[PDB]
Every structure is written in structure tokens, then in C-alpha cells.
Amino acid sequence: VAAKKHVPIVKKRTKRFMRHQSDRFKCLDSAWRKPKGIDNRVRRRFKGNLAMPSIGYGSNKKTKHMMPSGHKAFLVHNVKDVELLLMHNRTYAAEIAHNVSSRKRIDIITRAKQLGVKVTNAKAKV
Amino acid sequence: GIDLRWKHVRSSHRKAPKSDNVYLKLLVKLYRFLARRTEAPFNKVVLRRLFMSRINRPPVSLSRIARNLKNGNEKKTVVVVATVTDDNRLLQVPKMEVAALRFTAKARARIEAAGGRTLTLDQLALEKPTGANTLLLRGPKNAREAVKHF
Amino acid sequence: SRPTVTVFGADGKPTGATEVLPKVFSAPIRPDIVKHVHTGMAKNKRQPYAV
Amino acid sequence: SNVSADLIWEVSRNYNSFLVKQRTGTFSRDALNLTNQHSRKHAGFVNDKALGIVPAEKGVKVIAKKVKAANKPASSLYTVTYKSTARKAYKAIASQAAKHGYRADLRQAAVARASAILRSQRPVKPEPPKKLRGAAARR
Amino acid sequence: PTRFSKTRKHRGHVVGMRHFHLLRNHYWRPSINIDKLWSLVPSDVREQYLSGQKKDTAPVIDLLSHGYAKLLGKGRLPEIPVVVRARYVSAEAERKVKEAGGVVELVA
Amino acid sequence: IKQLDAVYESKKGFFLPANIVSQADLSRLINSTEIQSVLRAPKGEARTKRAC
RNA sequence: AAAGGGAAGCGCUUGUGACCAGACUUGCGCCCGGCGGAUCAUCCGGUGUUCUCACCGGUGCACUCCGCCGGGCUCAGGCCAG
RNA sequence: CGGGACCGAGGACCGCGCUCUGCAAGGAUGCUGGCGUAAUGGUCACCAGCGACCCGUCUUGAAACACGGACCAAGGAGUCAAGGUUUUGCGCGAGUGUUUGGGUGUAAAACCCGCACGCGUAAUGAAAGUGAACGUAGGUGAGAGCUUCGGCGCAUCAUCGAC
């Protein structure tokens, strides 16, 4: 069903924080690493460089962990797992675990349809 | 930019016990309610000493209690947020009403044989919720090997 | 008086007998001390390994 | 004595077998937990007086703790199956939760859980078909 | 435990004389003061003496059986006569025992 | 069940421990008449109105 | 598929092309009309409970309850805007 | 008295008030249109405007010099033991420590047992040796808390005494 009424969801930044020189080196993964060299341009925060993550980029406490529909994802593995969201159909959406078989997926989708609970990946294995 | 020559200071005091004792947690909840809802500074001091650690809670002996029971304190309820220990050097235990965190077996037996009463701190909070007619006692803090070696 | 506990037979039904509850069942329940002793005690059957 | 509902909550507030902890919230699998939330307000196995509602074949089934039989789990539950009109079920559940002082703070949650179960027991409607969008999905 | 160490957090950022052939058993002589002397009496019997139900009986205490060779004189004694058998005694201890009404006997 | 008391009496150097709390029912302790009859008036509610 | 007048690579922000995730599809409450049934109110007995609240069995005889379908009305509903 | 820009945090009522049938008074509502899908939004590639030295490492005050780096995968560097010291938690408490050993066992686990012993309970002196109450375990000034409102005074500090 439709989610509970909430304030508009604001992302202060949608771009990821890319690791320095991971664009130029394939052995460097793009996952963020804080530069620790004393003469690093990014760590010293010269303009025109990569931004560094900080707590000022934090999201609104009312809309944290919300998908764009306004729900919060809850991982479910079976029918007894998806029945835990009986009282939270306006706030929580079920998300079937990736290793759940197709038959159990049909059972979970049927039970969540009865309970009025949104399934984020209901089209899978069909 | 704001010129802050002085620095705002975070608290240098315990606001919660580091112990994981569930009964101590219940006692802390009870005395938090009492210290929030009463005038009495006794409840605030008792909540503080419940927060305190073991080196900050030295034991109190029956001989020390008997020393402080003199001169008009014979009817006051003795409150010690520590362990009450027994003293062999005290041959005659006077009649006393003592509330404590815990008693040793010999101290409890000798108090009850002398005819006094042993209480816990929740019983103390039930009977004297404002700490009326009470003698609050502490043990010797500096009587430690480390403090002597300081 | 101390509380009692009912005795059940091989048919699952009470036999009409009761036993006085032992005093160890009113001991304080201390999960921190249980965890400490369990952490210490669960290592006592360990065999040593080395290269 | 040495055992209380407060003590049981202090023992099992961090871990129990009913706990489901995830990033977006903590839930409970307890049968006596209304709204399936981990809190002292809703921990039915912790609380001395507690209510729980489960679905039946048609209607609801409400269990309540008996305070005189806490040490007798086989006869610890007062169970009523409501198979009638939804309004009568809500009235009986609200009376059972509020009229005699048996957890009046759980009245709204119990009526809500009964309504949710009775609404889930209704037949589902057929969904509208999925519309292909764009160019690669459409063609 | 290794997971609690600071190193896991710091990952990514790094007179007189000489005595030949001394035998301590020669100089073994543990001491007890008089204010712990009544603690050697068993508890029930001690409580009977301190209450005063035994007005015609005097307790005899052997310090060597309890592991003490010398009776020292720190503290005070009640007005109950006690017989003390000790290898050594101090002047104040014997004075306080005789004030209490007893006698210190010397043994070996 | 009968032998449990003798088992815990036969443990030398160990007694059944004394708790630091006599009454574990915090609700009864707080809402008892002895505590509630000497409390102050409440200085507020659980929810505080925003002033400005 | 694309770029390239003696380096590329990166940051902010548009644009173009390619490709996508959501959201939505209607819900709830009244007023009529048409069906299908009597787990409507009261009373009696039994049972259980929180000891005044419930369930079960007889009683409804259809202006009372519960479902379904046709119409009408109100309210709430998605995106961008004036 | 006009003209323009950006913003609408909160979420039953309470309050301060006013021009008082109500209000511009403790935070945006009302009306209307188009569309209901890639239209908004998002990801990738590329162009454009502006911005932007190649990383460690070393040196001193700092640069420069110097040294390492063709690329990728897997390893790869403050660990363990003994003995101290301070702090945290726990048990017992003038005591404390079962596990050298014995009993027992569902058998390297768990449970039980106690003599000795270790540390603490007394110090000082090279040693022979001696060995801690004048006093409600003292006086004075502070000192939380309590009080019958006269005072009693924890811990701790300064100071004069006593052993």
C-alpha cells in the first residue's frame, strides 16, 4: 500500500566519494580511503580536488534508510519472516533474500499480497 | 569565526555505572526517579555513589559504624553505599539499623545477633524515601597500597 | 512457608505429591557473571596448536 | 523475590531468541508481542500481563497471560477465538484490554492487529498488468 | 583478546653484615596482638564468655597451636581472666593480660 | 529435587549469596504509597510544547 | 558506440545521446436500488476469565446484522506547473 | 503605498495578544491547468564554461635535491610468554587462593576434597633485639549529608599533640 506521510526525502549528495588516484590505478579500488600523506592535496583540501566525506553530509533523521517510495527495506527469507511486517505495511517493505528459491518466492509474494506489504523485488525468478 | 579563548568542558564525572549488574541497573533506575522527583540531596548523593567504582567505594567496618554511632546518632539509620565488613577487634556490636549495598556474612550475622537490622538500598528507598534520620558513612579512600605508593 | 512444586508421573499427570522448592532457585540471576565464568570455562578443554 | 518482569527485561533486552536485528530496525518473533517491536512496552514474554493475537481459519485468536499460572506454561494462557463480526471482535478485544486494567496501553495496538488480520483474511484483488516503458523494454 | 587492542585501531597509521647459610626457620616467630587474642576462641564459646555466662571458668589459649610465637600488646582486653601460653611476650602485652586478670605462661 | 538442598549445603566455603536488591519489582517500588506520597508535583509532561 | 590541432586522467554545473529504478492504476466513508445468507439486540444454561468481561449451544423471522453487484456524493490519492 | 528574489522547518488543543461573529496572534494554505509517462528523477559516454602539479618517503624551519614506483593477482610486517604498574568489571572479605596432589567422571571437560604454602593481617634496626590507646582512638579550623534546628559531623586537607 501507500507509505505513511513523510517530509520530502533530501539527499545532500548523490555522487559517491571516489578514492584518490583510483581512476589512474587499477589495483586501487574506488572505495573511499582517507589520504594520510602529509602533502596530499585532497587531505589538505585544496580547491578543485576530491571532496572528503564528513558528518555534515548526513541525511535527515526522519527520512534515513527510506527508499524513494517512503518505505524501509526489511530482508525476508520465508513466510514467517514476511509476516513480521503485518503491522508495518505503511512503513516497511519486504525484500526477498537473493538465495531464496522460486517456490518460496511465490509463497512470500502471495503472503505479502494478502498482508498488503510491498515487495521490492517481486518480479524476480518469474 | 568566533574567538573562543576559553574552552567548553565536557563532564568529568560518571553519569552511568560501568558495571553490567542488572540489579545495580534497577537500583540506578529507582534512585534516578527519586533524585528527579524529590528535594532531598541524600538521593542525589546515593545515586552518585551507586555510579562510583570499587576503589571509590572503600569498605566500612562495624567498628567504624560503632564509632560514628556515638553522640546522639544511636537511632539514626546508617547508610553506606559500599560493602560492610566485620571487625574482630570489636567485641560488642551495638544495636544498629544499617542499609548497605552488601554485607559480609559475619557482619550480617553479628548485627542480627546484636539485635539490629540489615537493609538493602531498595528497602532504604522504601522506608526513608527522603533520607530522613540517616547517618551517611564512607570508608577510608586513601587506605590503599596504590595511594600509599603515590 | 516455602513454596512447593508438583510431581508428575509417567502418564504426564500429577501424582498428588509435592516437593519443597530448593533455596537455590531464589538465587540472584547474574548474566554478567554467567558470561564471565562461561568465557573462562569454555577454553578449558582446548588442545594446543603450533607450527 | 529475586525474579521480576523488570529483571527479565534487563536480562533479555540485548539478546533473545525472538530478536531480529537489521539495519532498518529491530523486530520480535514473540507470539505475545503486539506490533512485533523490541521494547519493554511490547515484550509479551517479559511482561506479567500480556496479550497476543494470531490469525485463525476465519477470525482472530487472542491469548492473554494468567498471572496466577506463570510457572505453569501449559495452563498459562487464556485463549478466545473470535469468529464473528469485526466490530464485535474489536469491542471484545478492547474490553479485554482496557476495562479491568489489563494493559490499557496495548488497547490501540490490539485493535489494530485484529483489524490487520481481519483485513488480510479478505480476498485479494487482481493486479493491473505491467506496462512496458521506454524503447528497449517496449521493443 | 586481539580484537580489543589499540593496534587494530592503529592499523593504517603506522648494607651491613653478611649472613652465610641463613636459615629462616631459626627466626620464625609470628606475632599476634592482644586485640585479636579473643578471636582465637571459638565463636559460640567466645560469645558465652563475652556475655558473661561463664563466671567461674578461664580459657587457656595456646598460641603455638594457632601458629604464633609472640604475644604483642596492641589494643585493649576486656575484664575477663585468660591463660596465655606463648614462647615470647612483650611487656605491655603481659601488663595488659595481668590487668585483665590472667597470666602469661612461657612454653617452648 | 530432594537432594539439591543437601548438595548445596555440602559445598564447603560457599553459601547461597545475598542479593543487593530485596524487592526486584521496580514498578511496585516506584508506585508504592511510601514513595509516591512524598514526591514533588511533576514539573512537565513526556511531550513538551514548543514555545517559539 | 564515441573522442582526438604538441598528453590524458579528476572536481562543480548544464546540455545531448543511450539506458534505467521508482511512483500511479485507486482506497475509505455515506445515500439509494437489487441479490445471497442468518455467528443482529435481549433472555436461559454451560464454560473460561482480568470477577465483569467474553465464547459456546437454543431464541431472531427479516424497518435488525454480514458479505456481493449496480448507480450517486464527499474526502484522500502520482509528476510538473500557474 | 508599490515592484522583485529565495525559503514553508512544525504537525490535535494549550501560549502571548489584537483591529475580537473573527484574526496576518507559539513556522502555508486556498484555487486551477497539463500530463500520468521515461514527462520529472537517476546512471553511463561525450562536448562545453570555470577549477585542478605525481604519489609517497626523507630532510630541516621549510622547499629543492635524493630514493622507490612498467602492469596485475595472491600474500606480506607491534605477536606470544614471564614478571611489574595504573585503571575497569566480578567473587569473597581480615582474610583470600579448589585444579602440586587426592577423590570422582557420561573421561584432557565438569563436579567435589583438604594439609601445607603464597600474599595480606606489624613495624624498625647493620645486628643482638625490641615492638604500636593518657583521652567516647585526642585538640583546633574546614567539610557532604543528617538534625530534636541546640548541633552531630563521612571522606579528605592543614595544624598541634599521643604511642
Please tell me the distance in Å from C11's CA to the nearest CA on chain F: 20
Cβ neighbourhood burial of A17 (10 Å; 0-12, 13-18, 19+): middle
CB C28 within 8 A of CB B23: yes
Experimental method: cryo-EM
Distance in angstroms (rounded) separating the CA atoms of residues E23 and D48: 70
Q: Which of F1, F10, F20 to mutate to test the interface with C (most CBs of C within 10 A)?
A: F1
Q: Does F9 touch chain D (CB under 8 A)?
A: no
C26, three cell numbers: 531464589
Of the candidates D50, D56, D51, the one whose C-alpha atom is nearest the C-alpha of residue D8 is D50
Distance in angstroms (rounded) separating the CA atoms of residues A20 and A34: 9
Q: Does E50 touch chain B (CB under 8 A)?
A: yes
Instruction: Tell if the CB–CB gap between D11 and C29 is shorter than 8 Å.
Output: yes
Length of chain D: 139
Q: Which letter does DSSP use for residue D88 in this model? A: H
- Verify if strand G has an atom below 7 Å from the CB of A40: no
Distance in angstroms (rounded) separating the CA atoms of residues A33 and A53: 10
Distance in angstroms (rounded) separating the CA atoms of residues A123 and A110: 12
F41-45 contacts: CB < 8 A, separation 24 or more? Answer: F42/B37
Distances (CA, A) of B18 to B28, B30, B54: 12, 17, 11
**Coil, strand or helix at D78:** strand
Cα end-to-end span (Å), chain D: 74
Element (H, E) at D117: helix D107-120
String of DSSP letters for C1-19: ---EEEEE-TTSSEEEEEE
Cβ neighbourhood burial of D14 (10 Å; 0-12, 13-18, 19+): exposed
For helices B22-37 and D5-12, the axis angle rounded to 10 degrees is 120
String of DSSP letters for chain B: ----SS------S-SS-S---HHHHHHHHHHHHHHHH-S-HHHHHHHHHHHS-STTS--EEHHHHHHHTTTT-TTSEEEEEEEEE--TT--SPPP-EEEEEEE-HHHHHHHHHHT-EEE-HHHHHHH-TT-TTEEE----SS-SHHHHH-
Burial string for B22-54 (b: 16+ CB within 10 Å, else e) reads: bbbbbbbebbebbbebbebebbbbbbebbbbee
Q: Does C28 touch chain B (CB under 8 A)?
A: yes
Overall resolution, Å: 2.5
- Count of beta carbons in the 10 Å neighbourhood of residue E53: 9
Of the candidates E106, E105, E61, E107, the one whose C-alpha atom is nearest the C-alpha of residue E80 is E61
CB D9 within 8 A of CB B29: no
- Verify if strand H has an atom below 7 Å from the CB of B39: no
Distance in angstroms (rounded) separating the CA atoms of residues E59 and F26: 52
Q: For strands C14-20 and D77-82, give the pairing.
A: unpaired
Classify the phi-psi angles of B111: left when phi > 0, otherwise alpha if psi is within -120 to 50, otherwise beta. Answer: alpha
E50, three cell numbers: 563475652
E72, three cell numbers: 604483642
With the C-alpha atoms ordered F11, F15, F19, F25, is the resulting torsion angle positive or negative?
Answer: positive
Task: For chain C, list the contacting chains (3+ Cβ pairs, <8 Å).
Answer: B, D, F
Element (H, E) at D28: strand D26-28
- The alpha carbons of chain E give a radius of gyration, in whole angstroms, of 25
| CA of residue C4 relative to chain centroid, distance | 18
Distances (CA, A) of B134 to B36, B103, B138, C28, D80: 20, 18, 13, 28, 53
Of the candidates B150, B132, B131, the one whose C-alpha atom is nearest the C-alpha of residue B142 is B150
Distance in angstroms (rounded) separating the CA atoms of residues D3 and B122: 15
* Distance of C1' in H116 from CA in E45, Å: 28
Distances (CA, A) of C51 to C46, C48, D105: 16, 10, 62
Classify the phi-psi angles of E40: left when phi > 0, otherwise alpha if psi is within -120 to 50, otherwise beta. Answer: alpha
Element (H, E) at D19: strand D19-21
CB A60 within 8 A of CB A7: yes
Q: Does C36 touch chain B (CB under 8 A)?
A: no
